[PDB]
Amino acid sequence: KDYESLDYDRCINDPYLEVLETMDNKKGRRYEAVKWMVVFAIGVCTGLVGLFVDFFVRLFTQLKFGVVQTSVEECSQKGCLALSLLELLGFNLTFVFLASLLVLIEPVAAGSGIPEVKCYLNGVKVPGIVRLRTLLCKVLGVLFSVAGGLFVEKEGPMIHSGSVVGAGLPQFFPYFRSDRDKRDFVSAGAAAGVAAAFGAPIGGTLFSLEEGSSFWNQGLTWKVLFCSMSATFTLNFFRSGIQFGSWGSFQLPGLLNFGEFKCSDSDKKCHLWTAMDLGFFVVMGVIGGLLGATFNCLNKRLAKYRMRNVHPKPKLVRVLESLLVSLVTTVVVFVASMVLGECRQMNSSIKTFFCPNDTYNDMATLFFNPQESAILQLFHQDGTFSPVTLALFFVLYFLLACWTYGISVPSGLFVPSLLCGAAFGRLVANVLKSYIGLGHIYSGTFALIGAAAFLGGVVRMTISLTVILIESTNEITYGLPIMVTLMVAKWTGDFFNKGIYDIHVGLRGVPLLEWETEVEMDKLRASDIMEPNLTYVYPHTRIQSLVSILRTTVHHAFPVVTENRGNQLISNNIKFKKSSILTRAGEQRKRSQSTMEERFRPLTFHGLILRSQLVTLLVRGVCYSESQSSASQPRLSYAEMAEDYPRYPDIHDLDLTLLNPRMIVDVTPYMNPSPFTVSPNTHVSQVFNLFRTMGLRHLPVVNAVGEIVGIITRHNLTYEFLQARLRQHYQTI
Amino acid sequence: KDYESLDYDRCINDPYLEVLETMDNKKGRRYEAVKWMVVFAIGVCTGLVGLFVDFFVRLFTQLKFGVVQTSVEECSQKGCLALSLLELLGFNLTFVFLASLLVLIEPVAAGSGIPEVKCYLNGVKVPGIVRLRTLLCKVLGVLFSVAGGLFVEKEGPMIHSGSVVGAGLPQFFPYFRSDRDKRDFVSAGAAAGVAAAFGAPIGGTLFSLEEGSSFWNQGLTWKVLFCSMSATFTLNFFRSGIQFGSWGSFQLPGLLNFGEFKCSDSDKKCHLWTAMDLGFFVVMGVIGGLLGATFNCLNKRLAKYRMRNVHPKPKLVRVLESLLVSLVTTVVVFVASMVLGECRQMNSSIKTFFCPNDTYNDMATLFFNPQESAILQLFHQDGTFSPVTLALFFVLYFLLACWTYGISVPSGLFVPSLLCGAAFGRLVANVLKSYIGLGHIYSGTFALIGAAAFLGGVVRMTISLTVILIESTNEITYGLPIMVTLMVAKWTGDFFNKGIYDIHVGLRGVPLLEWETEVEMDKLRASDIMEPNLTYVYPHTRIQSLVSILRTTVHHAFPVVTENRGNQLISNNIKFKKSSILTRAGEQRKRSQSTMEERFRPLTFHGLILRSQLVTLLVRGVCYSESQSSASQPRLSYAEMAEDYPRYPDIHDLDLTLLNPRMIVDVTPYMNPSPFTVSPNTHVSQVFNLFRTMGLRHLPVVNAVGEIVGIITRHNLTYEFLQARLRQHYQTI
Numbered sequence A, B: 001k002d003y004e005s006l007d008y009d010r011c012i013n014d015p016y017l018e019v020l021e022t023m024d025n026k027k028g029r030r031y032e033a034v035k036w037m038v039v040f041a042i043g044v045c046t047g048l049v050g051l052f053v054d055f056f057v058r059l060f061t062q063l064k065f066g067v068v069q070t071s072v073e074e075c076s077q078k079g080c081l082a083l084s085l086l087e088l089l090g091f092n093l094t095f096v097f098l099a100s101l102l103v104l105i106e107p108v109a110a111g112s113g114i115p116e117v118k119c120y121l122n123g124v125k126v127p128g129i130v131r132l133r134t135l136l137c138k139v140l141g142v143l144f145s146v147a148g149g150l151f152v153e154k155e156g157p158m159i160h161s162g163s164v165v166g167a168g169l170p171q172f173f174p175y176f177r178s179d180r181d182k183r184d185f186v187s188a189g190a191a192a193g194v195a196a197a198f199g200a201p202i203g204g205t206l207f208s209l210e211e212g213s214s215f216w217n218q219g220l221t222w223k224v225l226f227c228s229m230s231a232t233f234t235l236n237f238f239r240s241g242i243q244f245g246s247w248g249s250f251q252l253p254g255l256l257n258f259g260e261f262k263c264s265d266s267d268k269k270c271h272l273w274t275a276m277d278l279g280f281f282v283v284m285g286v287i288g289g290l291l292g293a294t295f296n297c298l299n300k301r302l303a304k305y306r307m308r309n310v311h312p313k314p315k316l317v318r319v320l321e322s323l324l325v326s327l328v329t330t331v332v333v334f335v336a337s338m339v340l341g342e343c344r345q346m347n348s349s350i351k352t353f354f355c356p357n358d359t360y361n362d363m364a365t366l367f368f369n370p371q372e373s374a375i376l377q378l379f380h381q382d383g384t385f386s387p388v389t390l391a392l393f394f395v396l397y398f399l400l401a402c403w404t405y406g407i408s409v410p411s412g413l414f415v416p417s418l419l420c421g422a423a424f425g426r427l428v429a430n431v432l433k434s435y436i437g438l439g440h441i442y443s444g445t446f447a448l449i450g451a452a453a454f455l456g457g458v459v460r461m462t463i464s465l466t467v468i469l470i471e472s473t474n475e476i477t478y479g480l481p482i483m484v485t486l487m488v489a490k491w492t493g494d495f496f497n498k499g500i501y502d503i504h505v506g507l508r509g510v511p512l513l514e515w516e517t518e519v520e521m522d523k524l525r526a527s528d529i530m531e532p533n534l535t536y537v538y539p540h541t542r543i544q545s546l547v548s549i550l551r552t553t554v555h556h557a558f559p560v561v562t563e564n565r566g567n568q569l570i571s572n573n574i575k576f577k578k579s580s581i582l583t584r585a586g587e588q589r590k591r592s593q594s595t596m597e598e599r600f601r602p603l604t605f606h607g608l609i610l611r612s613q614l615v616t617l618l619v620r621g622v623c624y625s626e627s628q629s630s631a632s633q634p635r636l637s638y639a640e641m642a643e644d645y646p647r648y649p650d651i652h653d654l655d656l657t658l659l660n661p662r663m664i665v666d667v668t669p670y671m672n673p674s675p676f677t678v679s680p681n682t683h684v685s686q687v688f689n690l691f692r693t694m695g696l697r698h699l700p701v702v703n704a705v706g707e708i709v710g711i712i713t714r715h716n717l718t719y720e721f722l723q724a725r726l727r728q729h730y731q732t733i
């Protein structure tokens, strides 16, 4: 596949300089105030999207579980026990069918949105991730998927749903059109989505700080923190005013909350955790890492099977697959609820199914409750679940969650991984207490650590995940046990495979820049990875050359260079080359006054010109005849160049009949005169640091005599390319 | 004053390349494991330093208040009430005298350490901030200053005390000698100090992320977070095992904890805060900003008075000043305790002085308790303090804290600013309740917001302060009220002046690089700020030229250049210039094979050589005679060059008699061949961004023909220089 990076790096040219001269400090303050308003609006809209999802998910789940429960009672008294299953199947197969049609409409909405937000914040531009139809096909697709009982989550796709809003809202005010601002706003939207999904605004801010790992922008972080705070306190304001009666109160954080981690007042010896518990937490982490590695291995194999045996099929398939998994999931839940469910002697939350009077089914209250409610029941209830029920539930949920992720419907992954771990932690707590007396500590701490050591095993996130979990638990004393079970569960799994998001990004072939380069690649140099063969643009070039290079080549940036070694064209190029060069003595006096040889030729580097800018110049009548001076020019302003920003014209789309060939066009005023440059002797570590942190695109390599010697893009710094070049370097020596 | 920046930027030269070739992946993993161990040790040692301070501060305070309290009782029954004052004066004047002698020993330990940590993390190297004697003169100076009742704090100097440990411990293992690692370790130590002082490891991590605003280091942040977690959970483990009996439990976080913010179970209408409270919080923020601005104005005037009327005096003064302020702040406390104190009918915390039976003195229990205890009493305890007592206490504490900061003793500023705000918040809560009924909300929320809106007024920190306060309160629902009163209390104060740390850094004249440049300076270019006159080093230069440039000039880096336009020296320079250049066709074929004018001259840029490297080469016999080939050379290895890292020899210290002049020395193998470079057309925004984030030093400016036209350092990007050059630019046009 072919992917195109973002134009994050600022291009300062003559129209931008005119706008700069016009602007003053008061206009800057007004623009910054408008930016604050837009950030607040993005946060509020993400909170509202989360509210819309949450309200209707439960409005449908309650209806579906209130139509079957009476059917369960009557068909159980009659002994038929078949009408309820049929009604549940009808509900699930209708909801999943509606959720899969909405993904046939927009295929990018499939799965968790996080793999497509790790890429946009990296600057890769997955072709359809920030348009409104994707938001409609994901928000409406989730509430028909999780309401159909597919063992999926809602807080996963919330990051993508917030990212879409952050991309859309700032665009209406031409000052917000550039990608330099769009990437900042999508980072703010992702932070807001994380905050609204987990109730951890600091966690969302740190999630946005990496995955977009650029220079520390103090002021952008202070805005993406306010966006997350506004997102998590707008969802809270409405969700604590609809469920309860009090409106002004803020009684419950975002969609996934853990609860209150306090021990009973009766036991003074009881503590949340003690120094002895840390040894148990280290083993829980290394077991969770192995379980997450098994999960990732199985899901990677399943995805490899699907990408070759299901995707290359008519659109009728990828709907039958989702219906099949929904039918299997419903039948397994219902059968494991009537049978293998332990009726225990005894609330609105608790569910009584297939059990006698004054008795409840632990498996039924596990499965028929919403996943967020089941997490609370596994955190803060003791003695409700027997160890056999917990083991069977863990096995079934683990297998079905592994088999479900990858199908067309907009699935999530945080909750189904945060809920198997809760079962594992509760099970190990139950077996520990019976085996040897450990009643001096809270029992829900083991469930929390089991959930954390499974998230760390599956998604393998750090910093962001640690802060998200700590802020979700609302207990700072869990700072150390969580972190030391997130850095072990990762270190255990890294031996086997990468995180699931990395797995599902690598299957598509998306070119990503890793967190940092290795030392062996630091042994490599910039000359080895660069591209010597160049497609260049002369200043004062002709229209024929421009259309030829635009049609022939797919590159999006061309260096503007002059030969180091038509008559009007040559004269203008020589004049520009002479005028541009600024000698040291000239600067001091200004201050005081106050074949293959032909193909590869010495070319003095002058700037970079984008394909978009060249096409914009071609569409307009920006050209001067050789007879007249180069001073004559339509001289497009900055607004005129930015009018057509979101979608630029394709060169094949232009008629090209009106354009007179052999007419000179001046690209000097519109090029980027001084982009970042690296010497051929710079090592790959410095090049990678510049490319990643500056967010730049098309880094040129220029030698010590000012001659451009190569070009470098994202495809040159990708991991497999560096591995191949390092292997070739070892082979040469 | 003259300050020298850090050598943060990596220098990759031939000895480094040899070490790189020797090293493999297993050695890299072992080195990373050792780095993890060193980070853990830094965290543990910072926690132990905090424990040492905390234990002895209370051990001295309890003795000092147990010697007077009895004496107060008997001298009050007799009516003398004079012996207790003499005992208190003796204790205070002895402790302050001992605290001021330890600062006469090490003058840098004076005041809060934060202004000296904002500079080192900026890369300015205040001359004595990371040596062991400073740690001894600050840790031991604090426990004799706060124990003497000077209205100072302990949590301020803890950041500097952790920074010193982080600077000292990694140096014993030559791999940790470079400043590239020292700055990382001092950032980790500062994060650990913040965590141990406030119990907010995430707050310390974010405090270290800025003030060192560089490229996003994923892996370094994950280490400075673990360092802070280890620091705050080692202090906790000992402080909850010494005060209590249980050792394994973690019952109390670092030195300054707020408590538990829960409302009484009796009132259901009661909440921590509600939506209508936000209007009151906004006004509390704008009042706290004005109070902080008044504090800053008064303290700046006092400091400007002291720096010209007290500092240029014999060392006998600056001790009499501290004794005078201690004598005043003892008499004021004692008099405001017997008089102006309301004896109210009624615990170990509560303090009774100058009151009849079954009564307590509210002012006396405010003053005679430790500041951390007074904060708790002002937060979670209602009805104890009358509004008159609170107003008088706020006025007295505000004035004496403003007058105390700046004297020689190691004062702090967080607690004395976090404690006036608590009094203001409690006062406004008491006034509001009597004025109109607002019993539907918690009363300690107003105290918390008043403290936050005074910290925001005084120190004017963001992001870091917000997270520190949120994690200290142990309540995530306080995220929004706190943030919206830190962004207002700052926005109100910015109209008047800057924070205490900015003021007290600017008074010394330390060159700092701001968070970002303004748009008006973005109008400016790199040619305007650069330095055209250059002191350069030829490759294969003679000893005489090197000693001349080293003695004549104070610059610490010299460009290695060759003239663009002895016979052996000229021949070697020409050969090097010819061999170094790599043309584009050469790269392709290698892949396929597999007066004023004399002073300012065209010079092709080849690299940068540090003064330290030149002095190291001069000290050894690194030189070859013109008769013999340049290939002959002692060829110092990496370890030999790094043997003398912390303190480099001064050129005047060398005898220079042994060194034979007119012997050629080749500096090519040891220079930095490919540093970061900027074109003269680059604007000041990009130049500042590169300089600040890459942490680099001596950025060279090279034109389009490879000729170096200028040099840029920290002094060129400082705010005053940019303002002057922008004013000149406006004058020219």
Ligand SMILES: Nc1ncnc2c1ncn2[C@@H]1O[C@H](COP(=O)(O)OP(=O)(O)OP(=O)(O)O)[C@@H](O)[C@H]1O
Binding pocket: A003, A004, A005, A006, A530, A531, A533, A534, A535, A536, A554, A555, A556, A557, A558, A559, A697, A698, A711, A712, A713, A714, A715, A716
């Ligand atoms: N103007 C250019 N002239 C020659 N080679 C180029 C040019 N631009 C990029 N390359 C090289 O071509 C290869 C990939 O080119 P590609 O068509 O993917 O670039 P692009 O579409 O402009 O970039 P991106 O995918 O990052 O948006 C890389 O090796 C890159 O260094």
Ligand SMILES: Nc1ncnc2c1ncn2[C@@H]1O[C@H](COP(=O)(O)OP(=O)(O)OP(=O)(O)O)[C@@H](O)[C@H]1O
Binding pocket: B003, B004, B005, B006, B530, B531, B533, B534, B535, B536, B554, B555, B556, B557, B558, B559, B697, B698, B711, B712, B713, B714, B715, B716
């Ligand atoms: N090698 C050099 N040749 C000429 N000018 C220089 C050189 N190095 C620095 N300068 C300029 O001299 C001025 C200040 O020089 P200074 O003596 O403070 O530098 P330094 O001590 O090497 O740097 P630093 O203070 O950042 O450690 C600045 O304008 C800077 O651009």
Ligand SMILES: [Cl-]
Binding pocket: A153, A154, A155, A156, A157, A412, A413, A414, A415
């Ligand atoms: Cl989720």
Ligand SMILES: [Cl-]
Binding pocket: A112, A113, A114, A156, A157, A412, A413, A414
């Ligand atoms: Cl997910």
Ligand SMILES: [Cl-]
Binding pocket: B153, B154, B155, B156, B157, B412, B413, B414, B415
């Ligand atoms: Cl402090």
Ligand SMILES: [Cl-]
Binding pocket: B112, B113, B114, B156, B157, B412, B413, B414
């Ligand atoms: Cl301080």
Ligand SMILES: [Mg+2]
Binding pocket: A002, A003, A004, A554
């Ligand atoms: Mg492309």
Ligand SMILES: [Mg+2]
Binding pocket: B002, B003, B004, B554
């Ligand atoms: Mg200097």
